[PDB]
Amino acid sequence: SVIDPSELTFVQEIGSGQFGLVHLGYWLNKDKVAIKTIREGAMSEEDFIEEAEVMMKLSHPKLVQLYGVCLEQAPICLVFEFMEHGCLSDYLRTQRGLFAAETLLGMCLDVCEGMAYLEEASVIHRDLAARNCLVGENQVIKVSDFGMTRFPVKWASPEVFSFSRYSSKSDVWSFGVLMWEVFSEGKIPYENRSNSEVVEDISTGFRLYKPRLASTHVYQIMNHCWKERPEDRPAFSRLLRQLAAIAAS
Ligand SMILES: C[C@@]12Cc3[nH]nc(C(=O)Nc4cnn([C@H](c5ccccc5)[C@H]5CCCCS5(=O)=O)c4)c3C[C@@H]1C2(F)F
């Protein structure tokens, strides 16, 4: 779990700040890693180490891997899998107009596969969104921010924004919104709406509009994730088969 600091070389700052202070680095060389600096006393060493170990166990090619934790010296950090092509939100936005619908659907399949793994381990993400996903080798998309997380109403299911009632089904609502962000090529959901207007509109039955590149079938899957009650929303396991099936149909 714990990396001796002598084994790391920090190079340059990378990223636009959606994950804070990140460097490109090398680990016991010349393996590229992303190193993320964190605050000194948010956890206590034991909890922190035990949660780095739990995170490292959650090992799936659609999840950005934690390699370990460097805490011998300050500033302390997280050592992560390096993701060649940065944050999905920027990847999508800078390259608007250059994706086939099929390519956008494959991106939602990548996330859904990571999420179906978390779902199966009884792990709730709680902040799933395009900004928390990263793009790798051969443009694979991977999910991050599912551990070491120590209000985004736009991604929150109604029972999360009303009473913080989190579940894998509230992650499914968030994944609907991520699907909209992907198919709209990184547009901001409910962009000119305040938090309480989002809340009031969602309560009334309002839903994000259909992006031009999303087919009718895809948008119907979107609207299933945004079912008002969690019991009506499909589970990731079923969404994974479904999206792959629509890809094939
Ligand atoms: C949860 C983590 C893990 C993590 N892994 N990789 C990153 C990360 O920021 N990757 C990144 C950022 N920039 N780049 C590219 C890069 C940068 C430097 C050399 C080579 C390629 C950029 C190349 C220039 C065009 C834009 S780009 O494609 O974004 C990769 C993260 C962040 C997040 C964390 F560490 F906490």
Side-chain angles (χ1 to χ4, degrees), residues 12 14-15 19 22 24 34-36 64 80-87 134 144:
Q12 90 219 55
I14 65 189
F19 303 94
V22 185
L24 179 57
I35 304 170
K36 180 263 249 284
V64 183
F80 284 105
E81 182 177 359
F82 179 69
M83 300 293 290
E84 195 161 3
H85 302 292
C87 180
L134 282 152
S144 199

Side-chain angles (χ1 to χ4, degrees), residues 1-3 27 48-60 63-70 78-81 117-118 123 146-148:
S1 148
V2 167
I3 295 158
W27 180 26
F48 182 72
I49 286 174
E50 289 8 292
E51 292 305 290
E53 289 178 353
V54 168
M55 261 245 283
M56 289 181 68
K57 198 141 289 130
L58 310 168
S59 186
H60 188 282
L63 302 176
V64 183
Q65 295 305 112
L66 183 74
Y67 294 147
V69 116
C70 186
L78 311 180
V79 187
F80 284 105
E81 182 177 359
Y117 177 95
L118 291 180
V123 180
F146 57 91
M148 308 275 33

Side-chain angles (χ1 to χ4, degrees), residues 97-131:
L98 307 175
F99 305 104
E102 289 89 336
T103 299
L104 298 170
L105 171 57
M107 287 180 178
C108 304
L109 223 90
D110 294 355
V111 174
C112 191
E113 191 184 332
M115 289 311 305
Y117 177 95
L118 291 180
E119 176 178 79
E120 168 67 11
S122 287
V123 180
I124 302 156
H125 192 301
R126 307 189 194 206
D127 188 24
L128 179 59
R131 81 186 129 77

Side-chain angles (χ1 to χ4, degrees), residues 15-38 41-197:
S16 322
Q18 48 265 296
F19 303 94
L21 178 48
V22 185
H23 293 255
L24 179 57
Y26 295 98
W27 180 26
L28 275 199
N29 298 188
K30 309 179 57 44
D31 325 358
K32 272 146 52 169
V33 299
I35 304 170
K36 180 263 249 284
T37 305
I38 57 169
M43 220 158 315
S44 92
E45 185 172 299
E46 221 46 301
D47 290 330
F48 182 72
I49 286 174
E50 289 8 292
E51 292 305 290
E53 289 178 353
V54 168
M55 261 245 283
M56 289 181 68
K57 198 141 289 130
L58 310 168
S59 186
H60 188 282
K62 300 295 108 95
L63 302 176
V64 183
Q65 295 305 112
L66 183 74
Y67 294 147
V69 116
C70 186
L71 76 219
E72 196 221 64
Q73 74 182 201
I76 60 189
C77 54
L78 311 180
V79 187
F80 284 105
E81 182 177 359
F82 179 69
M83 300 293 290
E84 195 161 3
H85 302 292
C87 180
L88 175 57
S89 54
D90 297 323
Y91 184 100
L92 290 164
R93 289 167 180 158
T94 59
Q95 292 175 98
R96 185 162 299 177
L98 307 175
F99 305 104
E102 289 89 336
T103 299
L104 298 170
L105 171 57
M107 287 180 178
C108 304
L109 223 90
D110 294 355
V111 174
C112 191
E113 191 184 332
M115 289 311 305
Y117 177 95
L118 291 180
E119 176 178 79
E120 168 67 11
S122 287
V123 180
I124 302 156
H125 192 301
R126 307 189 194 206
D127 188 24
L128 179 59
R131 81 186 129 77
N132 273 333
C133 296
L134 282 152
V135 188
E137 279 267 319
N138 301 142
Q139 300 77 49
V140 65
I141 308 305
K142 302 184 195 211
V143 180
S144 199
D145 202 35
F146 57 91
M148 308 275 33
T149 61
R150 288 32 177 266
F151 196 103
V153 66
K154 291 176 172 191
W155 282 272
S157 62
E159 72 282 359
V160 170
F161 72 56
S162 299
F163 219 52
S164 287
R165 176 162 49 111
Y166 288 97
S167 68
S168 271
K169 293 301 197 71
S170 61
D171 283 344
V172 167
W173 177 292
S174 312
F175 168 81
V177 179
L178 176 162
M179 276 180 87
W180 182 99
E181 295 182 280
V182 168
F183 275 88
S184 69
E185 296 176 286
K187 276 310 226 193
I188 297 166
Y190 315 106
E191 192 180 81
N192 280 264
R193 258 115 262 0
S194 63
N195 278 14
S196 68
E197 282 173 3

Side-chain angles (χ1 to χ4, degrees), residues 221-235:
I221 295 166
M222 288 184 214
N223 276 285
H224 281 115
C225 303
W226 306 324
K227 282 291 170 202
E228 189 164 57
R229 319 146 169 30
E231 72 272 9
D232 294 329
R233 294 179 210 142

